[PDB]
Specification:
Two copies of one chain form a homodimer.
Chain A lengths: L7 H14 L15 E9 L3 H10 L7 E8 L6 E8 L6 E4 L1 H5 L3 E2 L7 H14 L5 H8 L8 E4 L12 E8 L10 E9 L9 E7 L2 E3 L2 H9 L12 E4 L2 E4 L2 E8 L3 E9 L2 E16 L4 H5 L1 E3 L9 E2 L12 E9 L5 E17 L6 E13 L2 E9 L5 E9 L4 E2 L8 E5 L2 E4 L1 E11 L5 E16 L2 E12 L2 E2 L6 E3 L7 E9 L5 E9 L21 E7 L35 E13 L16 E8 L10
Antiparallel strand pairs in A: 1-2, 1-18, 2-3, 3-4, 3-5, 6-7, 7-8, 8-9, 9-10, 11-12, 12-13, 13-14, 14-15, 15-16, 15-26, 17-20, 18-19, 19-20, 20-21, 21-22, 22-35, 23-25, 24-25, 26-34, 27-28, 27-29, 27-31, 27-34, 30-33, 31-32, 32-35, 33-34
The structure holds a molecule of 3 linked components (NAG-NAG-NAG) (2 copies), 2,6-dichloro-N-imidazolidin-2-ylideneaniline (2 copies), calcium ion (4 copies), chloride ion (3 copies) and copper (II) ion (2 copies).
PDB class: oxidoreductase
Keywords: amine oxidase, oxidoreductase, quinoenzyme, TPQ, clonidine
Assembly: dimeric
Chain lengths: 623, 623
């Protein structure tokens, strides 16, 4: 319960403490304007490892239970975003601004995530005071307002060309609310500068219509009237109790980061802790296209929220009928705690494949949850094997984002329908794998194979390409940073100080199970924000100053990243320290006809494996 | 059903015809000595494709149903192995020799696989003539027959250092009869020369005792008696009619080659053929060590028989209790047909993960078979997805090979017991994927992603790394032969002539999934026999003269291979021809403590994916 997500009651307490303690008068974030003071979110502040392990292993008292509140200070001479550490629960006595502490300075107010109320005010502007200025061309293309269809908007990110920018390409789509929302692009995109704290000052800085750009909608309308614009017509055996799952072989505390997504703590196999924490850090997406949004889009999904955008799992569909179903509570953009029903599910999965052949079939423990944004869907799986192996997979599915088809559009994807292109994109996800193999003190090994031509002892006149094992202990972080798209040692394992019964260092190896979306060139002005994408796998010294490889604040200002993961790799020693492993997994997705109306989970996904390597003395037991 | 394996009735008739034609001097292969004449095996002769398709598609009469008989002609001045085509079934009248026609000449007698009678005769020699010579050292190390555990022999291959050799290193192991009978290597290996036609003339050419090499066993005993030898004492919807599966979505004819292994013909998703044939071709293993057998062993398992060594599927273990099980029939080293009970199992598996999202469940059809040699176990999987996708998967499991632990043994693996090493080795499998995408005439496309620094259209001063698609039609065989370990197109697919509704070439893409082992250096004078291991993927024109990428006769003479796969690649055009795909999957295996007593199929193994890429005009429907 030192890893348990804040209870609904706990959420209320922090919210009450803020109102009573904070000098500035706060507005409900659900109805907050840019120049208002509001609480964006409050959630569990993860405890220090040292105090947690002291409690977990040495019977010391639990660490002070704390919450981290994100506050939008827009109602002052100089607006800022402030992170407040509140605690200790159940009854708070302090409220510490750790902003400067964690980031070296203040959080620029433009890095703050776009409020829901900000989206709605952007819609008012578009529908009420922008779109009508191009009714003639909209009536023409898309039966606009004339007893015809309803249109809707799509968001994109980041929002500008440099730091300080808050200008978003919003696309116009049909409001067909069936199997596919952004499957009918109108080819009309609007660049709305919404950086100003006064919405009446927001403007459209440029328009994109079906191929070409215009300064504003008034310019587009007259060229249309003047018959100067060509318009394309668009038609249409284990027990969950609290945060703790316990089987005969496994024990772990689970949870959900409102921004970082699904996580698991204190992973113990048969009483022995394998890892302190296995958590999702960030989910990314890079697009390509000849239309603005698809041309520019680079998603750092934690800027939105993997937990905040998690959905209830449908019993029988998302998880087996006899699965265990847990709820989740959150305060993001609200006054009162909200509850997500069936956010998680744990169940037993008979693989149907013989685990060993006298033997028995492969039965697995599965921890699952789903994040959904605009209908796309990430299904996050954590599977725990009876032999001590852990499997972490990601599955993408749902509706793809679309682009209006014009010109050399096929240079950026495939046609999936009339006037519709499926733009290229790569999916990526970052995981923090804080293995504690045989305790804190860890080393890193790189074992692989080699063929060396040597003479045959019984026939020295003949040679034989001798297959043999190479081993190397990595000394610095730099040696253990493995570039995506390159080759890493086939057996890369974190080992303990001690060895097994046979003299081999007790180890758990990480096996990356993911094809290669393929890294963004470091020449990209925003690549630093997702520099975790450079590596297939990286090992660093765990620090309390390095809790995440990304940040909520990166999405809207990637040009100056709040968290630049590459900074973590700094030539420090990794021999005999508390080590963390960061795994990047993903794939290239060139959309195709089969992806319509939905992209299916067909395949076995993308992720990695954690497997015992000289950790036990022989094949372990099982119930 | 012209792809059906020969029935028992057919197997009997061919043997009768073969006995009548081949004089009165034939001998039951089960009891034949090297100088005898016997029928090694009789199995189905795969029909000509043109005639097969003409029958299936154009209603033309079925092509002649034939069998292939391998005959060991050791009874003559110049002994050879002969391949005979026998037909037509059901009542044969001819028996033609296709040996020269297929192999450019005679099959040398030393290439023939080692008969079971030959092995038993080798054991006799070892236990009657050989071991007794070293009774003193065996009593001391291994309680030879002093109330101690019994000894057995372990085979290895190839058998020599050059073409023409039949000299095998047999290892001596305790026969506990519990768990791994191969977990107790004594450190004694005999290099027996069983080349000669007269067993009485067979000799041991060298002996390896626990690290040291000796000329003969007597010398080893002599050396020991003189106290010049240290001895380490060793302790102690769908149904299936005949050969065809018929789900609501799929149709195919399954079978099993006596040597090649499991195979599928006439694969049809919703009535349309995707592939004429998908079959296992060869299974390989490459070891390392400082002990003889372990250092020399390179396997081409079809020399023993993936089918001949197939095992009964344990209901409720290898396949769900209520799956559909099918028997198999064969004649190998027997003049009477044998039955392999429950050789196959076909079943639907609820994937346990939603196909799409509320949404729909994901269930697959699974065709399984298991090959077993000395308790080491290949489980062959081909899963057909409701969306037209096909997953071919291989898992290994069971008892690993052990070696006597001495010297720089850890350079060749890990100690897994007392005086026991787990030698390094790679596993590999070759599959023949004859895709007929939209018909015979097929092309090959290479698709991937790329970034191009381009100015932002709405902000000229700034740049954006523009993600885009690259497409390239491959023209010759050499272009489609991608080296194992290197990087290849993320989107390589065979395409028909027709485009989809949207104008994209209808194709099925080959996504190769493996932690590929690591190719044997081409400097090795024997890797030519398994030159298929060079490429993770290769595409060649289909040829009736290139039915397989390996041969039963490769194993015992890899230095002059009967089939050298790379010969297929000869700069021929692959633009609008009958194309065949060849896929290599494998992995490096450094044995660990968890492999004892036996290694688990944990995770998912190795193989590949066949995915529809613009083959349809939208997501396919299900029934
Ligand atoms: C982001 O904005 C935050 C909220 O405006 C700033 O935090 C506040 O700064 C205030 C002004 O300095 C502090 O007020 C102090 O409180 C005393 C009463 O105790 C007043 O009399 C003083 O005017 C003032 N004292 C001074 C000069 O420090 C608040 O204590 C403080 N509020 C909280 C909750 O921290 C941040 O400074 C700003 N971030 C950055 C880094 O600029
Ligand atoms: C591998 O061995 C095979 C059998 O030992 C050889 O093939 C045999 O050779 C026989 C004698 O040369 C053939 O008999 C000849 O052919 C006709 C056909 O039946 C016979 O009537 C004749 O008696 C004889 N020729 C003449 C004119 O005297 C056998 O037909 C044949 N046996 C079988 C069953 O195939 C192969 O030659 C040898 N491999 C090679 C290619 O060298
Ligand atoms: Cl949430 C999700 C699921 C699958 C693929 C992507 Cl790229 C996703 N990410 C986003 N969707 C729109 C904003 N981010
Ligand atoms: Cl048949 C099999 C199953 C699993 C692994 C290997 Cl290397 C196998 N191959 C051989 N075992 C002994 C002869 N070859
Ligand atoms: Ca660091
Ligand atoms: Ca650690
Ligand atoms: Ca060829
Ligand atoms: Ca073909
Ligand atoms: Cl494992
Ligand atoms: Cl970019
Ligand atoms: Cl697919
Ligand atoms: Cu996608
Ligand atoms: Cu193995």
């Amino acid at each position: 319960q030192l890893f348990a997500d804040l209870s609904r009651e706990e959420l209320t307490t922090v919210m009450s403490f803020l109102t009573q303690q904070l000098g500035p008068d706060l507005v409900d974030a659900a109805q907050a304007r840019p120049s208002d003071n509001c609480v964006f979110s409050v959630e569990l502040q993860l405890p220090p490892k040292a105090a947690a392990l002291a409690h977990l292993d040495r019977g010391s008292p639990p660490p002070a239970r704390e919450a981290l509140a994100i506050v939008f200070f827009g109602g002052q001479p100089q607006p800022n975003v402030t992170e407040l550490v509140v605690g200790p629960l159940p009854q708070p006595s302090y409220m510490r601004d750790v902003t400067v502490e964690r980031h070296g300075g203040p959080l620029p107010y433009y890095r703050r995530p776009v409020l829901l109320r900000e989206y709605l005010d952007i819609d008012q502007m578009i529908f009420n005071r922008e779109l009508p200025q191009a009714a003639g061309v909209l009536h023409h293309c898309c039966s606009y307002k004339q007893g015809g269809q309803k249109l809707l908007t799509m968001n994109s990110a980041p929002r500008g060309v440099q730091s300080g920018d808050r200008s978003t390409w919003f696309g116009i789509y049909y409001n067909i609310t069936k199997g596919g929302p952004y499957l009918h692009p109108v080819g009309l995109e609007l660049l709305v500068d919404h950086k100003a704290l006064d919405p009446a000052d927001w403007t459209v800085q440029k328009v994109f219509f079906q191929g070409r750009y215009y300064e504003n909608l008034a310019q587009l309308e007259e060229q249309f009237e003047a018959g100067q614009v060509n318009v394309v017509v668009i038609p249409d055996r284990f027990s969950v109790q609290g945060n703790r799952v316990a089987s005969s072989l496994w024990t772990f505390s689970f949870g959900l980061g409102a921004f970082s997504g699904p996580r698991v703590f204190d992973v113990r196999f048969q009483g022995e802790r394998l890892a302190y924490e296995i958590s999702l850090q960030e989910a990314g997406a890079v697009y390509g296209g000849n239309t603005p949004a698809a041309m520019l889009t680079r998603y750092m999904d934690s800027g939105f929220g993997m937990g905040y955008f998690a959905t209830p799992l449908i019993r029988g569909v998302d998880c087996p009928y006899l699965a265990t179903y847990m709820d989740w509570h959150f305060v993001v953009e609200s006054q009162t705690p909200k509850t997500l029903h069936d956010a998680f599910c744990v169940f037993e999965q008979n693989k149907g494949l013989p685990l060993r052949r006298g033997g028995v079939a492969q039965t697995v423990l599965v921890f699952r949850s789903v994040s959904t944004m605009l209908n796309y869907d990430y299904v996050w799986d954590m599977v725990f094997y009876p032999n001590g192996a852990i499997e972490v997979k990601l599955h993408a599915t749902g509706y793809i984002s679309s682009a209006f088809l014009f010109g050399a559009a096929r240079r950026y994807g495939n046609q999936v329908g009339e006037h519709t292109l499926g733009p290229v994109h790569t999916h990526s996800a970052h995981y923090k794998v804080d293995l504690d193999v045989g305790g804190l003190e860890n080393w890193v090994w790189a074992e692989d194979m080699a063929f060396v031509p040597t003479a045959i002892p019984w026939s020295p006149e003949h040679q034989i390409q001798r297959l043999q094992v190479t081993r190397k202990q990595l000394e610095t972080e730099e040696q253990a940073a493995f570039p995506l798209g390159g080759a890493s040692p086939r057996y890369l394992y974190l080992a303990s100080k001690q060895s097994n019964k046979w003299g081999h260092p007790r180890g758990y190896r990480i096996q990356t199970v993911s094809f290669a979306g393929g890294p963004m060139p470091q020449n990209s002005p925003m690549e630093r924000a997702f520099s975790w994408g450079r590596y297939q796998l990286a090992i660093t010294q765990r620090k309390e100053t390095e809790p995440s490889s990304s940040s909520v604040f990166n999405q809207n200002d990637p040009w100056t990243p709040t968290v630049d993961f590459s900074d973590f790799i700094n030539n420090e020693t990794i021999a005999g320290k508390d080590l963390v492993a960061w795994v990047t997994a993903g794939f290239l997705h060139i959309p195709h006809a089969e992806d319509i109306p939905n992209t299916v989970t067909v395949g076995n996904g993308v992720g990695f494996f954690l497997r015992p390597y000289n950790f036990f003395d022989q094949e372990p037991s099982m119930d």
